[PDB]
Design a protein around this ligand. Structure first.
Ligand SMILES: *[C@@H]1O[C@H](CO)[C@@H](O)[C@H](O)[C@H]1NC(C)=O
Ligand SMILES: *[C@@H]1O[C@H](CO)[C@@H](O)[C@H](O)[C@H]1NC(C)=O
Ligand SMILES: *[C@@H]1O[C@H](CO)[C@@H](O)[C@H](O)[C@H]1NC(C)=O
Ligand SMILES: [Ca+2]
Lengths: 238, 138, 286
């Protein structure tokens, strides 16, 4: 995260660090004791083998993420309409082999419902262990920052992203920059507060640079992917 | 992709009749027509069920509604045995046919015009959305 | 018609530790809440997902009672949603049900703490009792589970072929696999043996080789068992003539602390309210 501050324990209990070969690569968001929402570009082949992924919950520092403190990922499900060139439908689910234990440090975030009636520039939060500056290294501590929703019509302007933002994507951040997700935040949560409840409205997807002017962050529209998520969890219960 | 043909199954553009959506029998190739028939609406978690006779979403009457029915709606949405809260809350509705048998949950309800309890069903299938309550700084 | 007598069960001088917490289901009886809090030396009584004033003059299907003594240094762990040792490794408080938490105490002079390891596989391989001072209360910091095929001793035939880092060995019970070891060579050093769960299952560099798996307790569950240092199960050059047995100090990840403050042992109790306004567990407070 560029432009954020260090996060406290329990501030973001759904945030998880996803390690491939015990190195942090992407973030995720807990929705059920055994399901985690993340980005599909994080798990492109050959990184689709669920045996390679371990998830760390409730831990705020990367050096405290010893092997064995993480949970073994059992299954990885990329969106079947995911396009790697346009980053369209950049959403993926991960199932844990053993369910988490919820407490003040590990809690799920609510999946969004239809008719949320969000504001055009609704105040949101992003979080993750991504770099704090462009072309930086994975941050040690969990960071979080305030971003505002950017109307897709404005984000699709010829001066921002020329009709590259699809209905499966939403924009957040600032058209002046300074605050944005970055390298290592992919799959991380984009959450807002309404009715005293935190909702997962986006997963960190793509963008041009980090916190640059006219280049806000693009996130997967989790509301659009809501039907697909429910269908996947419904099938695993079997 | 199914405007002049029906409702898109999302199974590579296959279309079926809107009357066959959430009608109990699986027509779509992947059953997409019979697995997303129950949802939660708005920031107040208003329980809704898609009716096939009317081809639209409608809230649920609190008449004879209990916890087991809410857990059956949560299993239908993919939350498995998870359940958190359920209560009544303040025009086409879905009254609850008690003698419906061992049928899908969204079929245990029939369309009506009013609920005798005056309240619709609010449902939360999992305890989520709670974090650190920040500070008291002005 | 009969009396619940909850106060007598809560005032029994044989108090368990959080490791071996006890449970009593109260059903089909009549209870007086106001006299209950009087007969027990109540310190605090709050409720979660339930308001206390609606217990007086109400019927429930059953009232489930869990209780255990409180290690003084671990009182903060009993806060709802705490990630402390008590709820991670001994008793996880159900935060979803309608519950009530009761803190009270008994005279220390008459209280005998019952520290008992509930792990079946811990007792199978050497663990007998905690020989601790009076009023000391055992709590686990980490729990580990194993399959039925578990055994912590390396095979005597394997150990005999170790030129370096020879593991202790003994015979394992029938139906249990031996400790997974491996004869390895590095540089010119040959028969350098490498076994699992090293240095110990708590700080294991590779937890995937250790058959002992970390496990947090869930609601209604007990501790799966203390992790065992497998380098202390069996003896060096032990034969098949020696049964696999771990020493007392091979069991790790547990501590203890007294419950006595102001000459009284502090006790925790969790109430579970099942089926409000339904059942035959009625209140006589009205
Ligand atoms: C309830 O369902 C049963 C079983 O199909 C049916 O016979 C009955 O007519 C239904 N009642 C109403 C009021 O819909
Ligand atoms: C506690 O022990 C003392 C001394 O052994 C005994 O006199 C006393 O009666 C006991 N307390 C109770 C409540 O029985
Ligand atoms: C032992 O338990 C582990 C837990 O990870 C499980 O994978 C395995 O199938 C069980 N059985 C054996 C024989 O290892
Ligand atoms: Ca159908």
């Amino acid at each position: 995260i560029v432009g954020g501050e260090s996060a406290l324990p329990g501030a973001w209990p759904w945030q998880v660090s996803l390690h491939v070969q015990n190195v942090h690569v992407c973030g995720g968001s807990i929705i059920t004791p055994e399901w985690i929402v993340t980005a599909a570009h994080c798990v492109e082949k050959p990184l689709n083998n669920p045996w390679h992924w371990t998830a760390f919950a409730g831990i705020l520092r990367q050096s405290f993420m010893f092997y064995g403190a993480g949970y073994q990922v059992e299954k990885v499900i990329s969106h079947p309409n995911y396009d790697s060139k346009t980053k369209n439908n950049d959403i993926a689910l991960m199932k844990l082999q053993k369910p988490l234990t919820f407490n003040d440090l590990v809690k799920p975030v609510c999946l969004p419902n239809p008719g949320m009636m969000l504001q055009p520039e609704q105040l949101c939060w992003i979080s993750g262990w991504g770099a704090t500056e462009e072309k930086g290294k994975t941050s040690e501590v969990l960071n979080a920052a305030k971003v505002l929703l950017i109307e897709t019509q404005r984000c699709n302007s010829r001066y921002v992203y020329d009709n590259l933002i699809t209905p499966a994507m939403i924009c957040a951040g600032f058209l002046q920059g300074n605050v944005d997700s970055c390298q290592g935040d992919a799959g991380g949560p984009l959450v807002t507060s309404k009715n005293n409840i935190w909702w997962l409205i986006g997963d960190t997807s793509w963008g041009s640079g980090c916190a640059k002017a006219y280049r806000p962050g693009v996130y997967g529209n989790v509301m659009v992917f809501t039907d697909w998520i429910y269908r996947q969890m419904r099938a695993d219960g079997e | 992709k199914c405007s002049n043909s029906g409702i898109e199954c999302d199974s590579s553009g296959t279309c079926i009749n809107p009357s066959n959506w959430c009608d109990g029998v699986s027509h779509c190739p992947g059953g997409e027509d019979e697995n997303r028939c129950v949802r939660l609406y708005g920031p107040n978690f208003i329980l809704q069920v898609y009716s096939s006779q009317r081809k639209s979403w409608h809230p649920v009457c609190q008449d004879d509604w209990n916890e087991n029915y809410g857990r059956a709606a949560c299993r239908d949405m993919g939350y498995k045995n998870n359940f958190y809260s359920s209560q009544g809350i303040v025009t086409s509705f879905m009254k609850l046919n008690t003698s419906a048998g061992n049928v899908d949950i969204y079929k245990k309800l029939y369309h009506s015009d009013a609920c005798s309890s005056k309240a619709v069903v609010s449902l939360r299938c999992i305890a989520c959305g709670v974090n650190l309550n920040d500070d008291d700084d002005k | 018609l009969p009396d619940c007598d909850i106060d007598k069960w809560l005032n029994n001088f044989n108090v368990p530790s959080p490791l071996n917490w006890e449970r009593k289901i109260f059903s089909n009886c009549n209870f007086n809440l106001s006299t209950l809090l009087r007969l027990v030396h109540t310190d605090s009584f709050s409720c979660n997902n339930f308001d206390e004033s609606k217990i007086y003059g109400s019927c429930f299907k059953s009232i489930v009672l869990d209780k255990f003594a409180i290690p003084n240094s671990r009182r903060s762990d009993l806060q709802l949603g705490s990630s402390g040792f008590l709820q991670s490794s001994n008793y996880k408080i159900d935060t979803t049900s309608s519950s009530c938490q009761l803190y009270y105490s008994l005279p220390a002079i008459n209280v005998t703490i019952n520290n008992y390891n509930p792990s079946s596989w811990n007792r199978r391989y050497g663990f007998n009792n905690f020989n601790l001072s009076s009023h000391s209360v055992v709590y686990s910091r980490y729990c580990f589970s194993v399959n039925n095929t578990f055994c912590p001793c390396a095979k005597p035939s394997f150990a005999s072929s170790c030129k370096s880092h020879k593991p202790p060995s003994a015979s394992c019970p029938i139906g249990t696999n031996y400790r997974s070891c491996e004869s390895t060579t590095v540089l010119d050093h040959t028969d350098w043996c490498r076994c699992s769960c090293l240095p110990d299952p708590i700080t294991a560099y590779d937890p995937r080789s250790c058959s002992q798996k970390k496990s947090l307790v869930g609601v209604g569950e007990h501790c799966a068992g203390f992790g065992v240092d497998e380098e202390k199960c069996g003896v060096l050059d032990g034969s098949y003539n020696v049964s696999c047995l771990c020493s007392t100090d091979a069991f790790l990840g547990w501590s203890y602390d007294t419950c006595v403050s102001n000459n009284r042992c502090n006790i925790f109790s969790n109430f579970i309210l099942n089926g409000i306004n339904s059942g035959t567990t009625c209140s006589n407070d009205l």
